């Protein structure tokens, strides 16, 4: 459910959202369409969750690596601009947004990590990585540190891991081989072991995240840090005499940062699909719109040929553009979400000592191709599970979350038609059988019944129409059709609130002929109620 005549924009909270709002306010002052820009927490995981249900924003902003898994799930609307529009951007920026030979987003700016050093504490920056442990002990005796950067996200650590030979998926003959993963080779191990050696020798702290590393550098407590173009203005507010230069070398090899291309996607369920096309083309992809976002938090090396040449002489942009040449462009295959999750748990568990470097990377090697390891992005509905597994519904082997018995063909169908969400235990998808579902639905009515109300009253108190409220069957949990909801209104039968959920009775459960028995099948102690709420969508 997305409004008409209105565009909602989502962007990362560190990419300068207030600058994009200025571009939107001029779009509303000229076109009359109120464009709202927001920045949700973890929008790269929250977007596919809410885009699958046809909801979400109209415009999604992120690097190109996540856009492949979106459009593959049918979440991104394809884009076909004009014959003269593709010419004002660099051609390699469109390559990063081309999935299955079709454009899926609007390329904006090219991102790449760089070294950020304090010129007062550190006159000349270190050229290599190995010369930092000795440099830290010099600053340690003065009360400061050498380096502090975000260790909780693998994007900042990847340049060191890819330095001696680590890679994501082998790229050859124009295709990425998801079978050949290079996160556990000698190059990857050497890069991560050197990072853990910095933690063991107490040169860095594994607890350091983006804010801690940023607050410690902007206060003057660390000599240098690793970040992107978005953090330049945050140091400009402080009086830190900083410098942006090339990344240090590891084993004499250049660091290989994963080059990110910030892109703009349009939700396939957005009614204003062409209203959002002319906005990005005529208001963001102009020289003034990019400057407003760059004044807030810098975008790096933008793709627009016009405005890029103006600030191409930037000593910070030149260093970012050089780090991008020695790195490599991020793949846009759908497996990138599972890859980043495997490396993130590999780096964190290796930094904290939860497991050795070999153990973390070996687990990451197998988890890079897995599907259910990432709890955020995971098949929630049955058709998503079958499409992800590439197996039909009758070949699925789903056990009940309660009794661990395998569902039959008809129960798998019932699970999908009832709009039940897949439940995961030990990273394994589960469903629910007919016996367990109708039992705990009645146990829930016996224990967590709150109140009942007429459908006419329910509208006036939620100030929403009855066909917009999700009402499930009190006995079989099937979502009531608009015709079944109108059934309660005409017959003057109240709806029932069980545990905060509103329920009614569908066509099949309206009578329940006498020949049937009351439900008694099962194959504080409220844990069954929490499991049921997972099956219905965690409120
Ligand atoms: O760390 C995994 C993460 O890496 C990148 O995320 C970057 C984002 O791309 C950068 O532009 C910047 O925002 O920092 C993020 C790291 O926290 C990839 O862009 C993203 O696909 C991936 O999840
Ligand atoms: Zn069961
Ligand atoms: Zn029913």
Curated annotation (Swiss-Prot):
UniProt entry tagged with the keyword Nucleus: no
Membrane-spanning intervals of the chain: none
Q: What is its main location?
A: periplasm
Signal in keyword set: yes
- Supply the alphabetized keyword list: Periplasm, Signal, Sugar transport, Transport
Please provide, alphabetically and separated by semicolons, the GO molecular function terms listed in this UniProt record.
carbohydrate transmembrane transporter activity; maltose binding
Q: What are the GO cellular component annotations?
A: ATP-binding cassette (ABC) transporter complex; ATP-binding cassette (ABC) transporter complex, substrate-binding subunit-containing; maltose transport complex; membrane; outer membrane-bounded periplasmic space; periplasmic space
Q: Which PROSITE patterns match?
A: SBP_BACTERIAL_1
Q: Name the Gene Ontology biological process terms.
A: carbohydrate transport; cell chemotaxis; detection of maltose stimulus; DNA damage response; maltodextrin transmembrane transport; maltose transport
Subcellular location field = Periplasm
Domain of life from the UniProt record: Bacteria
Induction of expression: Induced by maltose and the transcriptional regulator MalT. Permanently repressed by cold shock in a PNPase-dependent fashion.
UniProt record similarity statement: Belongs to the bacterial solute-binding protein 1 family.
Quaternary structure and interacting proteins, as annotated: The complex is composed of two ATP-binding proteins (MalK), two transmembrane proteins (MalG and MalF) and a solute-binding protein (MalE).
Its function, per the record, reads: Part of the ABC transporter complex MalEFGK involved in maltose/maltodextrin import. Binds maltose and higher maltodextrins such as maltotriose.
This chain's protein is named: Maltose/maltodextrin-binding periplasmic protein
The species this protein belongs to is Escherichia coli (strain K12)
């Amino acid at each position: 459910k997305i409004e008409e005549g209105k565009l909602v924009i989502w962007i990362n909270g560190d990419k300068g959202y207030n600058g994009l709002a200025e571009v939107g306010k001029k779009f509303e002052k000229d076109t009359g369409i109120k464009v709202t820009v927001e920045h949700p927490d973890k929008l790269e995981e929250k977007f596919p969750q809410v885009a699958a249900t046809g909801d979400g924003p109209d415009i999604i902003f992120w690097a190109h690596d996540r856009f492949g898994g979106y459009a593959q799930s049918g979440l991104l609307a394809e884009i076909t601009p004009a014959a003269a529009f593709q010419d004002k951007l660099y051609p390699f920026t469109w390559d990063a947004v081309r999935y299955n030979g079709k454009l899926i987003a609007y390329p904006i700016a090219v991102e790449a990590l760089s070294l950020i050093y304090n010129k007062d504490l550190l006159p000349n920056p270190p050229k290599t990585w190995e010369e930092i442990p000795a440099l830290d002990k010099e600053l340690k005796a003065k009360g400061k540190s050498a380096l502090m950067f975000n260790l909780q996200e693998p994007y900042f650590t990847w340049p060191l891991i890819a330095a001696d030979g680590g890679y994501a998926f082998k790229y050859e003959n124009g295709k990425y081989d998801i079978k050949d993963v290079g996160v556990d080779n000698a190059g990857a191990k050497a890069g991560l072991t050197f990072l853990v050696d910095l933690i063991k020798n107490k040169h860095m702290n594994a607890d350091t995240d983006y804010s801690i590393a940023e607050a410690a550098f902007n206060k003057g407590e660390t000599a240098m840090t690793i970040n992107g173009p978005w953090a330049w203005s945050n140091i400009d507010t402080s009086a830190v005499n900083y410098g942006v230069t090339v990344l240090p070398t590891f084993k004499g090899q250049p660091s290989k940062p994963f080059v990110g291309v910030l892109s703009a996607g349009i939700n396939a369920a957005s009614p204003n699909k062409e209203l959002a096309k002319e906005f990005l083309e005529n208001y963001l992809l102009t020289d003034e719109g990019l400057e407003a976002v760059n004044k807030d938090k810098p975008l790096g090396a933008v793709a627009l040929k016009s405005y890029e040449e103006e600030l191409a002489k930037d000593p910070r942009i030149a260093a970012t553009m050089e780090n991008a040449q020695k790195g490599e462009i991020m793949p846009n295959i759908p497996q990138m979400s599972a890859f980043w999750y495997a490396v993130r748990t590999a780096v964190i568990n290796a930094a904290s000592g939860r497991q050795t470097v070999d153990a973390a990377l070996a687990a990451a090697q197998t988890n890079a191709a897995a599907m259910f390891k990432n709890p955020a992005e995971r098949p929630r509905k049955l058709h998503e599970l079958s499409s992800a597994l590439e197996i039909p519904y009758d070949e699925l082997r789903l056990n009940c979350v309660y009794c661990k018995g395998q569902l039959t063909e008809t129960e798998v169908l019932d699970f999908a038609f009832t709009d039940l969400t897949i439940v995961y235990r030990d990273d394994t998808p589960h469903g629910v059988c007919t016996k367990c579902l109708r039992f705990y639905s009645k146990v829930s009515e016996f224990r967590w019944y709150r109140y009942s109300v007429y459908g006419t009253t329910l509208e006036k108190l939620t100030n929403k129409g009855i066909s917009d409220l999700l009402i499930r069957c009190i006995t079989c949990q099937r979502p009531l059709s608009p015709e079944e909801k109108q059934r309660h209104l005409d017959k003057k039968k109240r709806f029932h609130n069980i545990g905060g959920r509103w329920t009614g009775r569908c066509i099949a459960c309206w009578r329940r002929p006498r020949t049937e028995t009351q439900v008694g099948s099962s194959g504080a102690a409220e844990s069954s109620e929490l499991t049921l709420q997972e099956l219905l969508g965690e409120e």
